[PDB]
Amino acid sequence: MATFLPATTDSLAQALEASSTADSILILQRLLADPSSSPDALRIKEQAITKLTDYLRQENKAEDLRILLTQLRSYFSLIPKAKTAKIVRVIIDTVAKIPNSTELQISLCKDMIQWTRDEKRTFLRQRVEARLAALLMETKEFPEALSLLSGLIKEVRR
Numbered sequence: 001m002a003t004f005l006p007a008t009t010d011s012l013a014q015a016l017e018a019s020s021t022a023d024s025i026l027i028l029q030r031l032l033a034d035p036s037s038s039p040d041a042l043r044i045k046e047q048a049i050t051k052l053t054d055y056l057r058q059e060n061k062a063e064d065l066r067i068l069l070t071q072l073r074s075y076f077s078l079i080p081k082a083k084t085a086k087i088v089r090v091i092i093d094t095v096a097k098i099p100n101s102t103e104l105q106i107s108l109c110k111d112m113i114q115w116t117r118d119e120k121r122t123f124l125r126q127r128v129e130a131r132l133a134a135l136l137m138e139t140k141e142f143p144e145a146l147s148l149l150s151g152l153i154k155e156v157r158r
Helices: 009-017 019-034 039-059 063-078 081-096 102-119 124-140 141-158
Strands: none
Touching: 009 019, 009 039, 019 039, 019 063, 019 141, 039 063, 039 081, 063 081, 081 102, 081 124, 102 124, 124 141
C-alpha cells in the first residue's frame, strides 16, 4: 500500500479529523515521508510537524520527539535556515514542557545546541545553552556550567 500520503490540505484535514491521537500521529508521520519538495508541500509539512509536536506533548512521549528531531535532519536541508531554527526551537521548548529525566534532558539540550550551531540560530542556541547551564547546576556539574555561562555572558553582552 501507499507508504506516503501526498502533502495536500486534504491530508492535513484528515489527520486533524482523526478520532485517535495515535492515528493522527501515524498519519502525520506518513505525510512527513512524502518526497515532494514543492513550497506548498513544505508549508504543509511544517504545519504537520507543529501539530505532531503538539500531539506528542499531549502524549508526553519525549523519546518520540527526539526520534522526530533525528528524522527531520534531512527535511531541514530544504527549508530557510531561519525557519529551521524556529522549528527546532519550538520543538525544544515543547520538550521542555515535560520535566525530570535530567540525563535525557541534558543529552537533548546538547544535541539541540549542536543542531542550532549547524543551523546558525544564535538566539535559540543561547537560550538552550542557558537552560543546559541551569540543568547542569541542578546536577551539580559546576565547572561545565561555569564555562558555558562564562562564554554565554560574553556572547550575549554584545
